[PDB]
Amino acid sequence: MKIVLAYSGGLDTSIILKWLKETYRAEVIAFTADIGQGEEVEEAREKALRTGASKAIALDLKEEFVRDFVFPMMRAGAVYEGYYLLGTSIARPLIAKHLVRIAEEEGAEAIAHGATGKGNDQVRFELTAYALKPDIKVIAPWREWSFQGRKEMIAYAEAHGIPVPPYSMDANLLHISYEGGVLEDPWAEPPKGMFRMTQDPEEAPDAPEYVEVEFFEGDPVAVNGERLSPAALLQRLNEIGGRHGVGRVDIVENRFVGMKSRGVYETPGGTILYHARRAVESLTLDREVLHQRDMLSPKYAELVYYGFWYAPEREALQAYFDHVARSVTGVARLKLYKGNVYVVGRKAPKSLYRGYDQKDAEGFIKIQALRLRVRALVER
Amino acid sequence: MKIVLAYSGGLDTSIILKWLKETYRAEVIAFTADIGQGEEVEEAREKALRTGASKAIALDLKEEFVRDFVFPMMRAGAVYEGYYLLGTSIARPLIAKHLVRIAEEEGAEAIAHGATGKGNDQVRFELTAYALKPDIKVIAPWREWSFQGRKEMIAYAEAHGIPVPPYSMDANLLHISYEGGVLEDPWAEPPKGMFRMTQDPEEAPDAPEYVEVEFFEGDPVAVNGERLSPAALLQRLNEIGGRHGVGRVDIVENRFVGMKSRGVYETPGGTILYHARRAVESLTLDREVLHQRDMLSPKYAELVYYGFWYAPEREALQAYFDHVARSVTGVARLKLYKGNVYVVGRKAPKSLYRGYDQKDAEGFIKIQALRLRVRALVER
Amino acid sequence: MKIVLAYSGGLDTSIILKWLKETYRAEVIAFTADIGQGEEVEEAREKALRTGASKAIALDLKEEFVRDFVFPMMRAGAVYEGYYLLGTSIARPLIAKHLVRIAEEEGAEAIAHGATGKGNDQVRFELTAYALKPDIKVIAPWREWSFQGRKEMIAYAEAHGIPVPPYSMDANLLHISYEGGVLEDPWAEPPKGMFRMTQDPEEAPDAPEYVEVEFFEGDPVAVNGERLSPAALLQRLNEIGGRHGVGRVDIVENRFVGMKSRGVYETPGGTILYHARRAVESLTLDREVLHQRDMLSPKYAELVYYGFWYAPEREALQAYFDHVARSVTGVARLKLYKGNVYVVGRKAPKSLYRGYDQKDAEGFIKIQALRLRVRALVER
Amino acid sequence: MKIVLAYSGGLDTSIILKWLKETYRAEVIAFTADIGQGEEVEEAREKALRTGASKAIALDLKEEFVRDFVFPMMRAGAVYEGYYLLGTSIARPLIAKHLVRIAEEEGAEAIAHGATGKGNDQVRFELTAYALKPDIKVIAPWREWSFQGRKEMIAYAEAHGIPVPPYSMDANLLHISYEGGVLEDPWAEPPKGMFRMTQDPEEAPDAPEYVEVEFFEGDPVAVNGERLSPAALLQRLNEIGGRHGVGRVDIVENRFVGMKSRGVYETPGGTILYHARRAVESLTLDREVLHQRDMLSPKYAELVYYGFWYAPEREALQAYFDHVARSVTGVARLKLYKGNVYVVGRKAPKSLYRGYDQKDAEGFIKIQALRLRVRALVER
Ligand SMILES: Nc1ncnc2c1ncn2[C@@H]1O[C@H](COP(=O)(O)OP(=O)(O)OP(=O)(O)O)[C@@H](O)[C@H]1O
Ligand SMILES: Nc1ncnc2c1ncn2[C@@H]1O[C@H](COP(=O)(O)OP(=O)(O)OP(=O)(O)O)[C@@H](O)[C@H]1O
Ligand SMILES: Nc1ncnc2c1ncn2[C@@H]1O[C@H](COP(=O)(O)OP(=O)(O)OP(=O)(O)O)[C@@H](O)[C@H]1O
Ligand SMILES: Nc1ncnc2c1ncn2[C@@H]1O[C@H](COP(=O)(O)OP(=O)(O)OP(=O)(O)O)[C@@H](O)[C@H]1O
Ligand SMILES: NC(=O)NCCC[C@H](N)C(=O)O
Ligand SMILES: NC(=O)NCCC[C@H](N)C(=O)O
Ligand SMILES: NC(=O)NCCC[C@H](N)C(=O)O
Ligand SMILES: NC(=O)NCCC[C@H](N)C(=O)O
């Protein structure tokens, strides 16, 4: 029996790698993906072999991540419950996509991951796994094992000889998520010095910085005049935005599994792109088209959040969003200053921003008022 | 004949007052409403009697404004095209309401306003008027007079003897709007020194300032532990937020009367209220209720923007929003720092934030995955 | 230990009654509700005692059913996937509501039902049970026992002295549902003679029959001038509509558990009410209100279909629908002929059916066209 | 000056042809389109010449009408206010599209139509005209001339040699609309013998007729195994459906010009297609996709009704609808009987109508119920 494990290289997925061998007595193919977490994946790969993997694979997926997941999602203007830019949500589908690919390649009947039974990630990994390969089997150790505590796990790690040691965090090219630990108290401000991707505003440059982003057909293609690949462009904007401490949000969100959760996120580049896109949309999108698109954005967002990426509903909405986004061509000029991003200008080759006279407006008004007057009259 | 004129005490409404007497040779009742424009409305009222007003009326409407218009709208989470908090939009209905009432009290056959024939305001004034009194006669001088240019208009004023004097402004308790003139070029950053209600971010306190807002069944009832009437509360928050440069928006919006327009808005208190409300909602609203409310907010927003306040569709949606808002009770703790508003804490007496067995998750996932698996299998 | 069992009197629930006694060594309190199934509930209540219940309860819940469940649902214009009037769906919450109440009165820690683990009803029963009493225990034998087929179940029943008597059925005052067996092949027309509540259209009266239905504030209060209570009103319309073969539907629907199912439904009275309601709405509801309402109806229908009746989302939407329905006052006149229902007339005290001239229309047109013209000019 | 007139051949457009020549001192190019009104278009073309047209064009647009307007609309499941299949609405854009093309080829600066200044058609003609050719000049005689009565118009007609001859009618391949006159009283049943496209159910065959409709990729491509072009197919279904009196609707609709009107429509073929489509969709569309699609259909319907065909909103939604519709491939089997259309069967090559055990179902319920249980416990 072979099991392809989504291995990140930490203590848990290492314990899980051992656990899978003892519990199933199968070969465990470890897979580590580079999506910008800031770790050297080749290390995790070698640690995977050391830990017992029969085969470890490491792939650089930054470009695929931004090009085929982050960008399509951004075109839709996806935002979960007012503030979440879905940094972790869009990454999972990519990983799962590879786990199943590798499994079909290695002749592995199952895949495994270390997401807990209480979170959203388990749903994301599995819904995409089953959607891509219905016959695939999934193993989620967190839902199957007996450990009754952190302590038991560390011990178990030593029993097997695995290197060992306030909040949990997930980091990739789009953002860094922080939650759990002291963050569980919604009334408690995140601890000083917690953020890693964005410099702290109180320490950000005293002078504003200006940045311009060019969009071609729904996707950002250049920064300050320099053409950049999708992954390179996201990186560039994280640097510029991070320096100014841009893209910080603190929210209590609704998980798909049923309960609320306190989350803190930093999305510098993505936050710049969010506003840059709308700034350009303000000149290139028709009024009614925009209004309809914005009322659908929330649904698309919850789809992505729940894990329905490789689902027909999301791909259907995607057809609408891409169609609208095809017109988003132009440039946004933004001003960054201590945690804040201010749009200060925008231009577009086909801006709709430049017919009728005074009388016309009066007729428009009369026709629009008709039903309200009949209403009042009837209420007589 | 009698004509009730929404008189703001400015050049144009003064010109309009003379134009009304000279043209219709009717009795002109001037009406100035104090909605927080920061003008000694009493001056306006005297200046009107001194401009030919057969009777001038001034009313302090700050409380009614915030209580009967701003709060119901905030309760719904109204945001036009992603950034506009509708500062000017919700104020017009209030004015037209009184215009019509006064007209009925003074036995006047018609009312008048000085909104131009190219804007949204004329629609807001007139839809309100027609909805409240279908038989009302409306006179919009900007659509009826021959004046071309202001050089001309200045002449006419100087003529009848009427005091005479970069962008246009509209101010009230909720915000200050800037548009036109130097603002018409979408690529041009607004001019240094334009903002009046907010302190320039760069000139804002070097130390962050925390503020708490208490909501009771949808509405803000206190700040930093001090109970404050609707108007006093918005005022208090404008002061606190203004000093930090909070609530600045720069957008190119879609007008109802035809095309696009570049607008700049500062809504310090409202911006704080927007984030505070959502912070309290994150603990008191059900997931599915929230996702539905947010998908309807945009529609409510354009209704307000277009001028459909006293309209059946808006009042119907209001029933949905008021129902949901009734549960929003708690306190939000926010951190203000150089133009930004950060939520750092929230609490609620009836918080839904805390029967959970992880294996249940797997069953949840399998059922959710079914339709996806069938789909893939059929794709064979 | 006591268990409140939803006992319908058939073979399965009788077998379930025995099963629960032995399996849980619990005292079983049977509950049978009269919701218009057309059976003598008292005979079910007696059989329960014969079968072993420590107590048997039987209540006439037809009035509460139509008044507190069917009527509120109809006000919403609820239709699942274009045709399903939700006859079985809105009935389930009412049964469960009583199980929990009785359980509360008898000091029972659990409730049980005979819905299978493959369909929608189990979800409905339990979601309402959990929502009304969060700590109640539920027992669904179909998900807990291991019978390997009817054969074995008959034997089990015979063993306990439980009398043992092409498709499945569910009937109540709203409709009769048929599915399973012969009906599983979606390409096969239902067998002749299957329908019970409605006359075969080919056998309906050669003369059409006119009927008038009066609505007061969103609810039907009279038929042909005779004031009738909710339950009696549905009954009357079932008679009149049934005699003409009205209300027959044949569809393949999407289940909440994840698959597709072929269902046939007859809803004579409800189908007449559906068209009668819209007929009265056509004179009493505002255009924009109606359009917003119809776009929310489907969401509401799926909530009902899924089982989220006692859920905050459904209650919220209800506030909107009720607000709108309050204007539906008037009379609908329909013509019934061989399977079809034809609206033939309508009237209302506050009808909005019968303030501008031709010139006004041109202005309306010019303004609505502006954005379209700009778009075309930019396309050049 | 050259004016391209939408010439129907009747009295008013003949009067208009003369009116235009003398009023604008221009030559008139008459355009008559055959869209299935059951008229001899060449007779209208020749009558135009006799009336003074400098050139008369007559085109058979039946295939284009159904292929490029009706089908796209049906693919979206478009239905206005519950019953209107938009028979007249989708035909208007097609007419105007040709008026603009002819004006362009003929060097005409303007186009003219005979729609009155108080209806919906004027908006449809002009919105598409301006959208396709922004600088085109539109002349609508009804909003411009001074005729003050029918009598004066007849005298004018006779003066110019134009031959002169209960409700009004509009007929094309999709339907026949009836409104005005005796039909203006919403409480009055339409007069006997009014219908023309459909036989009265009272006179329809005693034997029901089965009909099969094959859908390829969202569009109907065959009837009873016979491959038919769009127009030939709609025609065929009108014959079959008409013989059975199928597709009659009687509604009071909300006009775009702000008021209500009583309309009676017979859409035999379109009605069969409506149900046929949903029958095939019941096996080919995913649950979530269908639900989203049905919530957007009404919006698309109002767009078509108001006249926003060649508009960005409609084309953006169309991208969504066409995406979904692409999966609609299969055959629908319906039973026609005295006014009714019954779906009795459906099949599809990629039917999603054929993965979990009861245990899975329990986990699903538990998770789905969590938030509801938390809500209940909090309410205490
Ligand atoms: N870079 C990555 N490559 C492959 N799989 C990953 C990666 N990041 C996360 N995952 C998958 O997501 C699941 C993990 O979660 P989280 O990201 O919450 O784990 P950790 O607890 O942060 O890391 P570790 O489990 O290694 O200690 C993992 O068990 C793994 O299957
Ligand atoms: N406080 C107020 N009371 C009554 N009417 C007002 C008030 N503020 C604005 N209005 C109405 O709105 C129309 C004005 O717009 P705006 O406020 O944009 O006008 P202005 O052109 O800035 O001022 P003015 O017309 O006095 O020179 C006015 O002409 C007036 O009829
Ligand atoms: N009138 C009713 N009163 C109480 N519970 C009912 C009633 N009708 C249905 N139920 C509940 O719904 C579950 C049943 O489903 P259905 O109605 O599909 O069952 P059956 O299989 O038709 O009947 P039986 O279980 O008696 O053989 C039942 O087992 C019962 O728990
Ligand atoms: N088949 C057609 N070809 C060209 N234009 C048409 C056609 N049908 C309708 N129209 C246009 O739509 C406008 C008409 O409406 P309607 O069809 O309601 O007019 P009528 O009143 O029936 O005909 P007439 O104007 O000849 O008296 C017409 O005046 C004409 O300009
Ligand atoms: N620190 C974390 O483990 N966060 C992972 C992302 C969780 C986030 N609330 C999400 O659902 O996307
Ligand atoms: N500065 C102004 O005169 N603003 C008037 C209000 C315009 C604003 N864009 C609105 O439509 O509400
Ligand atoms: N005959 C039946 O067993 N039907 C029970 C109701 C099923 C129906 N399709 C529903 O889901 O409500
Ligand atoms: N008989 C007619 O003149 N009807 C033309 C169609 C009008 C219909 N109410 C519509 O607006 O589509």
XYZ file of N, CA and C in Angstrom, chain C residues 36-119:
252
model
N -53.486 15.350 7.927
C -54.236 15.133 6.702
C -53.826 13.941 5.858
N -53.202 12.935 6.469
C -52.774 11.741 5.740
C -53.984 10.924 5.303
N -55.131 11.184 5.919
C -56.331 10.449 5.560
C -56.480 9.112 6.269
N -55.820 8.963 7.413
C -55.884 7.738 8.199
C -56.462 8.062 9.564
N -56.954 7.051 10.266
C -57.497 7.305 11.589
C -56.355 7.264 12.587
N -55.885 8.433 12.989
C -54.781 8.490 13.923
C -55.071 7.697 15.193
N -56.331 7.676 15.628
C -56.683 6.923 16.834
C -56.381 5.430 16.707
N -56.482 4.899 15.497
C -56.195 3.490 15.282
C -54.685 3.246 15.350
N -53.910 4.293 15.081
C -52.460 4.189 15.140
C -52.081 4.216 16.615
N -52.711 5.130 17.347
C -52.459 5.286 18.770
C -52.763 4.006 19.552
N -53.773 3.258 19.115
C -54.139 2.021 19.796
C -53.169 0.909 19.423
N -52.794 0.854 18.153
C -51.845 -0.152 17.708
C -50.518 0.031 18.456
N -50.147 1.279 18.724
C -48.897 1.549 19.431
C -48.946 0.905 20.810
N -50.095 1.024 21.471
C -50.251 0.426 22.793
C -50.177 -1.097 22.667
N -50.816 -1.643 21.634
C -50.793 -3.087 21.390
C -49.365 -3.530 21.112
N -48.636 -2.686 20.394
C -47.267 -2.985 20.026
C -46.276 -2.859 21.174
N -46.668 -2.190 22.257
C -45.769 -2.079 23.398
C -45.448 -0.709 23.974
N -46.004 0.355 23.405
C -45.722 1.693 23.920
C -46.224 1.845 25.352
N -45.495 2.608 26.161
C -45.890 2.837 27.542
C -46.941 3.928 27.550
N -47.079 4.597 26.414
C -48.043 5.672 26.273
C -48.136 6.017 24.805
N -49.325 6.394 24.370
C -49.524 6.736 22.980
C -50.280 8.047 22.925
N -49.770 8.981 22.125
C -50.389 10.293 21.959
C -50.764 10.487 20.495
N -51.912 11.115 20.274
C -52.398 11.379 18.931
C -53.040 12.755 18.959
N -52.595 13.631 18.061
C -53.124 14.989 18.009
C -53.547 15.411 16.615
N -54.595 16.217 16.556
C -55.076 16.736 15.292
C -54.264 18.013 15.096
N -53.308 17.983 14.175
C -52.451 19.140 13.935
C -52.634 19.782 12.552
N -53.789 19.558 11.939
C -54.067 20.099 10.616
C -54.116 21.633 10.567
N -54.756 22.244 11.558
C -54.859 23.690 11.625
C -53.492 24.335 11.881
N -52.749 23.825 12.863
C -51.425 24.374 13.159
C -50.525 24.205 11.935
N -50.658 23.062 11.268
C -49.885 22.753 10.066
C -50.062 23.806 8.961
N -51.305 24.048 8.551
C -51.574 25.016 7.492
C -51.288 26.454 7.919
N -51.734 26.808 9.117
C -51.558 28.146 9.646
C -50.126 28.547 9.987
N -49.385 27.682 10.676
C -48.017 28.014 11.073
C -46.879 27.503 10.199
N -47.189 26.717 9.177
C -46.128 26.207 8.321
C -46.404 26.389 6.831
N -47.540 25.882 6.363
C -47.885 26.002 4.958
C -48.128 27.464 4.549
N -48.918 28.201 5.327
C -49.208 29.605 5.005
C -47.973 30.514 4.954
N -47.092 30.441 5.967
C -45.890 31.283 5.961
C -45.014 30.956 4.754
N -44.992 29.679 4.375
C -44.198 29.229 3.237
C -44.777 29.726 1.918
N -46.099 29.719 1.820
C -46.753 30.179 0.610
C -46.588 31.678 0.433
N -46.608 32.415 1.539
C -46.440 33.866 1.477
C -45.142 34.184 0.766
N -44.172 33.288 0.918
C -42.853 33.445 0.324
C -42.778 33.050 -1.152
N -43.849 32.455 -1.673
C -43.857 32.032 -3.061
C -42.845 30.923 -3.283
N -42.618 30.118 -2.244
C -41.641 29.035 -2.286
C -41.912 27.890 -3.260
N -40.981 27.676 -4.180
C -41.080 26.598 -5.150
C -39.672 26.029 -5.313
N -39.502 24.746 -5.014
C -38.187 24.132 -5.134
C -37.957 23.637 -6.556
N -36.801 24.003 -7.103
C -36.382 23.639 -8.450
C -37.471 23.734 -9.517
N -38.163 24.873 -9.522
C -39.196 25.129 -10.513
C -40.555 24.453 -10.409
N -40.696 23.388 -9.624
C -42.003 22.743 -9.556
C -42.472 22.223 -8.202
N -41.546 21.732 -7.387
C -41.914 21.170 -6.098
C -42.457 22.165 -5.082
N -43.731 21.996 -4.743
C -44.393 22.866 -3.786
C -44.107 22.504 -2.336
N -43.156 21.594 -2.144
C -42.686 21.209 -0.817
C -43.675 20.603 0.178
N -44.631 19.812 -0.309
C -45.617 19.198 0.569
C -45.089 18.428 1.773
N -44.105 17.558 1.560
C -43.536 16.787 2.668
C -42.554 17.633 3.486
N -41.792 18.468 2.793
C -40.793 19.326 3.419
C -41.269 20.187 4.603
N -42.339 20.970 4.440
C -42.836 21.821 5.538
C -43.581 21.078 6.626
N -43.899 19.814 6.384
C -44.620 19.030 7.380
C -43.691 18.470 8.461
N -42.498 18.058 8.052
C -41.534 17.464 8.970
C -41.164 18.297 10.208
N -40.944 19.615 10.047
C -40.588 20.454 11.197
C -41.657 20.431 12.295
N -42.914 20.372 11.875
C -44.034 20.357 12.809
C -44.034 19.068 13.642
N -43.784 17.928 13.002
C -43.745 16.666 13.734
C -42.636 16.719 14.789
N -41.423 17.032 14.349
C -40.273 17.112 15.251
C -40.514 18.116 16.372
N -41.151 19.235 16.051
C -41.450 20.241 17.060
C -42.223 19.590 18.204
N -43.208 18.759 17.868
C -43.989 18.090 18.899
C -43.233 16.970 19.627
N -42.329 16.284 18.936
C -41.570 15.216 19.584
C -40.768 15.812 20.733
N -40.083 16.917 20.464
C -39.272 17.585 21.477
C -40.115 18.115 22.633
N -41.284 18.652 22.319
C -42.174 19.182 23.340
C -42.662 18.037 24.243
N -43.153 16.969 23.623
C -43.637 15.816 24.374
C -42.490 15.239 25.195
N -41.316 15.134 24.584
C -40.147 14.622 25.288
C -39.894 15.464 26.537
N -40.109 16.773 26.425
C -39.914 17.697 27.544
C -40.904 17.425 28.670
N -42.154 17.173 28.290
C -43.232 16.916 29.240
C -43.164 15.563 29.938
N -42.721 14.546 29.208
C -42.635 13.185 29.724
C -41.308 12.886 30.401
N -40.377 13.826 30.342
C -39.085 13.590 30.955
C -38.285 12.580 30.153
N -38.420 12.629 28.831
C -37.695 11.717 27.955
C -36.406 12.380 27.473
N -35.310 11.637 27.499
C -34.037 12.195 27.079
C -33.819 12.090 25.577
N -34.597 11.237 24.910
C -34.430 11.050 23.471
C -35.717 10.964 22.653
N -35.567 11.098 21.339
C -36.680 11.001 20.410
C -36.169 10.109 19.298
N -37.090 9.520 18.545
C -36.728 8.641 17.441
C -37.683 8.810 16.261
N -37.212 8.443 15.075
C -38.027 8.533 13.874
C -37.618 7.421 12.925
N -38.491 7.103 11.975
C -38.196 6.049 11.025
C -37.782 6.502 9.635
N -37.169 7.678 9.534
C -36.708 8.161 8.238
C -35.398 7.430 7.954
N -35.172 7.048 6.700
C -33.947 6.337 6.336
C -32.697 7.226 6.382
N -31.528 6.597 6.291
C -30.274 7.337 6.321
C -29.801 7.784 4.952
N -30.646 7.582 3.946
C -30.304 7.948 2.578
C -31.087 9.151 2.055
N -32.135 9.557 2.769
C -32.946 10.661 2.288
C -32.902 11.973 3.033
